[PDB]
Amino acid sequence: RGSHMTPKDDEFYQQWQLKYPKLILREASSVSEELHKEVQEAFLTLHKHGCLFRDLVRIQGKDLLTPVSRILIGNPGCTYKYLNTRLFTVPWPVKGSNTEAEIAAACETFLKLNDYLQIETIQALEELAAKEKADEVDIKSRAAYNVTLLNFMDPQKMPYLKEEPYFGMGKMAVSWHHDENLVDRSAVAVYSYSCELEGRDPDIWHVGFKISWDIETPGLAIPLHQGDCYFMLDDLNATHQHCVLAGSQPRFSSTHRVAECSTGTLDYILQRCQLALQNVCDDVDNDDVSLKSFEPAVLKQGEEIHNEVEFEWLRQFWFQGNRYRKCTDWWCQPMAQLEALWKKMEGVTNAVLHEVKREGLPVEQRNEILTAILASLTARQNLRREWHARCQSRIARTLPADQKPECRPYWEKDDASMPLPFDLTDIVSELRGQLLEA
Numbered sequence: 001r002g003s004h005m006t007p008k009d010d011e012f013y014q015q016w017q018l019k020y021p022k023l024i025l026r027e028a029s030s031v032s033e034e035l036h037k038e039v040q041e042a043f044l045t046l047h048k049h050g051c052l053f054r055d056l057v058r059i060q061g062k063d064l065l066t067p068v069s070r071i072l073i074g075n076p077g078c079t080y081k082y083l084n085t086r087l088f089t090v091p092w093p094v095k096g097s098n099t100e101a102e103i104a105a106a107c108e109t110f111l112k113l114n115d116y117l118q119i120e121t122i123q124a125l126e127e128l129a130a131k132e133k134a135d136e137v138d139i140k141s142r143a144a145y146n147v148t149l150l151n152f153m154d155p156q157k158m159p160y161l162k163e164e165p166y167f168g169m170g171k172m173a174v175s176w177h178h179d180e181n182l183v184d185r186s187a188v189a190v191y192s193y194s195c196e197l198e199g200r201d202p203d204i205w206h207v208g209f210k211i212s213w214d215i216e217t218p219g220l221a222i223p224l225h226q227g228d229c230y231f232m233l234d235d236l237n238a239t240h241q242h243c244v245l246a247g248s249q250p251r252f253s254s255t256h257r258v259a260e261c262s263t264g265t266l267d268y269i270l271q272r273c274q275l276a277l278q279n280v281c282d283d284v285d286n287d288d289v290s291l292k293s294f295e296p297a298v299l300k301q302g303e304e305i306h307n308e309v310e311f312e313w314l315r316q317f318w319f320q321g322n323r324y325r326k327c328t329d330w331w332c333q334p335m336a337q338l339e340a341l342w343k344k345m346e347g348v349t350n351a352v353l354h355e356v357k358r359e360g361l362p363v364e365q366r367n368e369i370l371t372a373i374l375a376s377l378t379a380r381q382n383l384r385r386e387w388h389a390r391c392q393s394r395i396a397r398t399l400p401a402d403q404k405p406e407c408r409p410y411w412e413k414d415d416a417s418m419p420l421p422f423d424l425t426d427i428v429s430e431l432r433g434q435l436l437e438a
């Protein structure tokens with residue numbers, strides 16, 4: 001049958017070397033007591049301050065609340081997306097940077113831990129190549145952790161856990177998965193903080209590993225003790241799945257990643273909004289939006305940017321109910337700015353819609369405009385329905401008022417502030433009809 005192996009098994013170590021040599025372990029002994037102290041207290045610090053939330057995530061069409069409580073720390077303006085949920089960094093003091101005293105201290109600590117792990121990770125990948133010898137830049141970028149996802153779980157207060165289905169590894173805190181949204185072949189480092197027979201010891205936390213598509217090959221269950229670190233190197237996260245097996249005591253972790261944020265940063269999205277608004281006459285800011293060109297390429301692109309800021313930025317931010325306010329104000333002004341920018345894009349879709357009706361506009365070029373924008377607008381209407389439904393589902397309403405989702409922006413048709421209804425069913429339908437006239 002399907003079994004697993006631990007340090008109890010004679011085969012365990014050779015199985016490790018032979019089948020998971022890109023998984024590395026650096027025991028609590030390899031880390032200074034000083035760093036242990038600052039890191040452990042920092043975790044406890046963010047706990048006390050209530051900085052950690054279970055995410056309302058999406059899996060195969062279903063709203064699910066992660067058993068695990070989490071928080072994202074890392075470079076300002078940066079984001080990490082998983083299970084359709086874009087987490088926004090609580091900022092850590094990278095250079096040239098400039099929210100509450102203790103919380104701030106905790107972030108700085110996890111940055112320090114970030115520095116050191118980076119150093120360890122580079123050292124291991126160098127060792128790794130010298131083994132495979134029998135570029136420096138690739139090594140550097142693959143260890144350039146711009147984030148850490150902190151996790152917490154107290155099995156005693158969150159005992160609603162699923163049994164491990166293939167190897168008998170027992171209760172799972174995190175189910176078999178690949179880590180999403182990472183740079184290619186980028187390492188991941190994990191600092192592990194536990195608070196105090198046949199098979200794995202159920203009282204103690206483990207990380208589980210299995211080869212993709214493979215349940216005939218015995219999985220590895222590595223025991224995680226207080227302050228132990230381990231590293232997933234090179235293509236290990238692509239070639240294998242991993243899980244977290246729950247012990248009996250609470251445990252925190254810091255899981256540093258190289259987030260693939262090419263479309264995932266404040267800077268990037270602000271720049272995109274700027275590009276869209278290049279098609280707008282910008283002398284003054286008022287609700288009479290006039291556009292420079294109605295050339296299809298440009299309008300399509302403007303409507304796509306409209307969508308990208310609405311759903312991937314605004315709705316994602318407010319669906320979490322602005323939990324981050326508790327930790328920082330960093331994103332408050334940028335999200336007012338992103339909404340202001342988006343609101344202006346609502347005037348653009350609308351001037352496009354005005355133009356399409358305009359009396360003396362040849363049907364050939366009209367049809368051009370429609371063909372350019374149709375996909376965008378129908379994607380906007382489908383994504384609005386979805387996010388509204390994601391905001392109102394039963395599991396959401398059970399969240400405390402400080403995490404209650406916020407469907408935003410959202411306006412009622414009895415609102416003269418917005419030039420277009422929030423519901424586009426009508427408009428889209430008319431556009432489809434026009435595009436099929438004779």
Ligand SMILES: O=C(O)c1ccc(O)c2ncccc12
Nearest residue numbers: 151174179188190244253255
């Ligand atoms: O160690 C953890 O607590 C952890 C939690 C959730 C994850 O997705 C992980 N992914 C890779 C390595 C560790 C983890």
Ligand SMILES: [Zn+2]
Nearest residue numbers: 177178179242
């Ligand atoms: Zn993972």
